Design an enzyme around this catalytic site. Structure first.
Site, PDB file in Angstrom:
ATOM      1  N   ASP A  35     -16.071  71.672  11.189  1.00 37.92           N
ATOM      2  CA  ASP A  35     -15.117  72.295  12.104  1.00 37.92           C
ATOM      3  C   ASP A  35     -14.615  71.330  13.182  1.00 37.92           C
ATOM      4  O   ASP A  35     -15.301  71.099  14.181  1.00 37.92           O
ATOM      5  CB  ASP A  35     -15.788  73.505  12.759  1.00 37.92           C
ATOM      6  CG  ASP A  35     -14.866  74.264  13.689  1.00 37.92           C
ATOM      7  OD1 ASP A  35     -13.646  73.987  13.712  1.00 37.92           O
ATOM      8  OD2 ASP A  35     -15.379  75.147  14.408  1.00 37.92           O
ATOM      9  N   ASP A 220      -7.323  71.300  13.168  1.00 36.46           N
ATOM     10  CA  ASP A 220      -8.522  72.145  13.139  1.00 36.46           C
ATOM     11  C   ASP A 220      -8.950  72.567  11.734  1.00 36.46           C
ATOM     12  O   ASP A 220      -8.347  73.459  11.130  1.00 36.46           O
ATOM     13  CB  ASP A 220      -8.285  73.398  13.980  1.00 36.46           C
ATOM     14  CG  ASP A 220      -9.515  74.276  14.075  1.00 36.46           C
ATOM     15  OD1 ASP A 220     -10.585  73.872  13.564  1.00 36.46           O
ATOM     16  OD2 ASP A 220      -9.407  75.373  14.662  1.00 36.46           O
TER      17      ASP A 220
HETATM   18  C1  LIG Z   1     -15.985  78.026  16.167  1.00 36.59           C
HETATM   19  C2  LIG Z   1     -14.720  78.571  15.431  1.00 36.59           C
HETATM   20  C3  LIG Z   1     -15.109  79.361  14.135  1.00 36.59           C
HETATM   21  C4  LIG Z   1     -16.087  80.404  14.122  1.00 36.59           C
HETATM   22  C5  LIG Z   1     -16.406  81.104  12.935  1.00 36.59           C
HETATM   23  C6  LIG Z   1     -15.750  80.780  11.727  1.00 36.59           C
HETATM   24  C7  LIG Z   1     -14.771  79.751  11.699  1.00 36.59           C
HETATM   25  N1  LIG Z   1     -14.053  79.357  10.534  1.00 36.59           N
HETATM   26  C8  LIG Z   1     -13.991  79.935   9.309  1.00 36.59           C
HETATM   27  O1  LIG Z   1     -14.590  80.947   8.961  1.00 36.59           O
HETATM   28  C9  LIG Z   1     -13.106  79.250   8.304  1.00 36.59           C
HETATM   29  C10 LIG Z   1     -12.648  79.911   7.142  1.00 36.59           C
HETATM   30  C11 LIG Z   1     -11.840  79.187   6.249  1.00 36.59           C
HETATM   31  C12 LIG Z   1     -11.500  77.845   6.512  1.00 36.59           C
HETATM   32 BR1  LIG Z   1     -10.461  76.927   5.303  1.00 36.59          BR
HETATM   33  C13 LIG Z   1     -11.969  77.228   7.688  1.00 36.59           C
HETATM   34  N2  LIG Z   1     -12.751  77.950   8.537  1.00 36.59           N
HETATM   35  C14 LIG Z   1     -14.476  79.067  12.897  1.00 36.59           C
HETATM   36  C15 LIG Z   1     -14.006  79.471  16.493  1.00 36.59           C
HETATM   37  C16 LIG Z   1     -12.600  79.936  16.040  1.00 36.59           C
HETATM   38  S1  LIG Z   1     -11.556  78.530  15.557  1.00 36.59           S
HETATM   39  C17 LIG Z   1     -12.702  77.261  15.127  1.00 36.59           C
HETATM   40  N3  LIG Z   1     -12.107  76.140  14.816  1.00 36.59           N
HETATM   41  N4  LIG Z   1     -13.994  77.332  15.092  1.00 36.59           N
END
Ligand SMILES: C[C@@]1(c2cccc(NC(=O)c3ccc(Br)cn3)c2)CCSC(N)=N1
EC number: 3.4.23.46
Length: 377
Positions: A35, A220
């Site tokens: 992430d 992101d």
């Molecule tokens: C930590 C946080 C977060 C929290 C909880 C799940 C997520 N991401 C996903 O579930 C997700 C799903 C499909 C893809 Br492709 C990429 N990511 C992200 C907060 C919202 S935005 C972000 N970048 N990170």
């Protein structure tokens, strides 16, 4: 060795790209969401319906409790955790083990998702956006401080058993073709960048370029969609609707709340426009563009129940917190997070999207007369 790191990512469409990591001594293996839009290393550390496994701190002799809690609400979902440190490694990453901060998630709501196959999140962004505050050193900062690993990593996300590659410590040329184009990181919190121009099927949206970056633009990997500021979103949707008007779309499709399906293999890709995002270049008033095909922003759903046909969700959505170039944008590009030189590079990746008529591309340079700073900051 970068070859050993190739293909170390996996995932499910719209579910997230994850890498294998270990935590603790002896090592406990977990799948961790990669992430670039957050800065905490956080892992499930108590039983949960959707968790296949979790971090068991009592079984790690190298765990140190920091005696601090952390509460992290999101727009959707939330979790509570206890901060501590332990030894962390990436089996198919750099050949090193480092001591890092870990938020042990003991309570959560709608945070963990059923079937995603990851048990935690690796926040690769900067300390400024770490929780509870910027004094909690992020993983990658710990990695660079404690090892000789160069301060950069690259991501090659491939859309729909291998989902892509995270290369730590350098650039793997086998993962891209053509030129690598760099855009400056405007501020080290998110990976913030500047969009200077947007075209939809070749047509300039002709907005003041500050509108494209209201109130920031970021790269992101932890967000599926291309997310756009209200004004830009409405203009993009207007353009895409006009281009695809020969077909009718269900109520709520353009809000992302409904599927559209076509008979196997008959998806009319050609009626959907390409989107070009021009990013600020490293030289004054120069830019380069990345071009996004409908194969990227119409995201396929892989649910067995719908599999007789090809069904898709619209993967562009409205944001009130700025532009987000999420996974559907990153897919097919090799993206270099060059922290050492405060820049992000884009090149066409070996798994880039294309059909017989069109292809994702990274092209430049383009020059602009107007000398306005497109930063909203
Ligand atoms: C930590 C946080 C977060 C929290 C909880 C799940 C997520 N991401 C996903 O579930 C997700 C799903 C499909 C893809 Br492709 C990429 N990511 C992200 C907060 C919202 S935005 C972000 N970048 N990170």
């Amino acid at each position: 060795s970068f070859v050993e790191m190739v293909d170390n990512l996996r995932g499910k469409s719209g579910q997230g790209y994850y890498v294998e990591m270990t935590v603790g001594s002896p090592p406990q293996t977990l799948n961790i969401l990669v992430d670039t839009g957050s800065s905490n290393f956080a892992v499930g550390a108590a039983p949960h319906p959707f968790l296949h496994r979790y971090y068991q701190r009592q079984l790690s002799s190298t765990y140190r409790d920091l005696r601090k809690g952390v509460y992290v609400p999101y727009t959707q979902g939330k979790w509570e955790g206890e901060l501590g440190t332990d030894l962390v490694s990436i089996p198919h990453g750099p050949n090193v083990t480092v001591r890092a901060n870990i938020a042990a998630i003991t309570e959560s709501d709608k945070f963990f998702i059923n079937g995603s196959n990851w048990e935690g999140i690796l926040g690769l962004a900067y300390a400024e956006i770490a929780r509870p505050d910027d004094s909690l050193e992020p993983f990658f900062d710990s990695l660079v401080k404690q090892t000789h690993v160069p301060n950069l990593f690259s991501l090659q996300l491939c859309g729909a058993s291998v989902g892509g590659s995270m290369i730590i410590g350098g650039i793997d040329h086998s993962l891209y073709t053509g030129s690598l184009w760099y855009t400056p990181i405007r501020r080290e919190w998110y990976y913030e960048v500047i969009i200077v121009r947007v075209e939809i099927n070749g047509q300039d949206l002709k907005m003041d370029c500050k509108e494209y970056n209201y109130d920031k633009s970021i790269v992101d990997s932890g967000t599926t969609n291309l997310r756009l500021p209200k004004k830009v979103f409405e203009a993009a949707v207007k353009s895409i609707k006009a281009a695809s008007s020969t077909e009718k779309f269900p109520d709520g499709f353009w809000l992302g709340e409904q599927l559209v399906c076509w008979q196997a293999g008959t998806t009319p890709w050609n009626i959907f426009p390409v989107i070009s995002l021009y990013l600020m270049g490293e030289v004054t008033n120069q830019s380069f563009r990345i071009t996004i095909l409908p194969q990227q922003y119409l995201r396929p759903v892989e649910d067995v129940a719908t599999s007789q046909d090809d069904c898709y969700k619209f993967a562009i959505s409205q944001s009130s917190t700025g532009t987000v170039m999420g996974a559907v944008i990153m897919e097919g590009f090799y993206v270099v997070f060059d922290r050492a030189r405060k820049r992000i590079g884009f090149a066409v990746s070996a798994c880039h999207v294309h059909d017989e008529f069109r292809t994702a591309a990274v092209e430049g340079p383009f020059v602009t007369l107007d000398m306005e700073d497109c930063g909203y900051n």
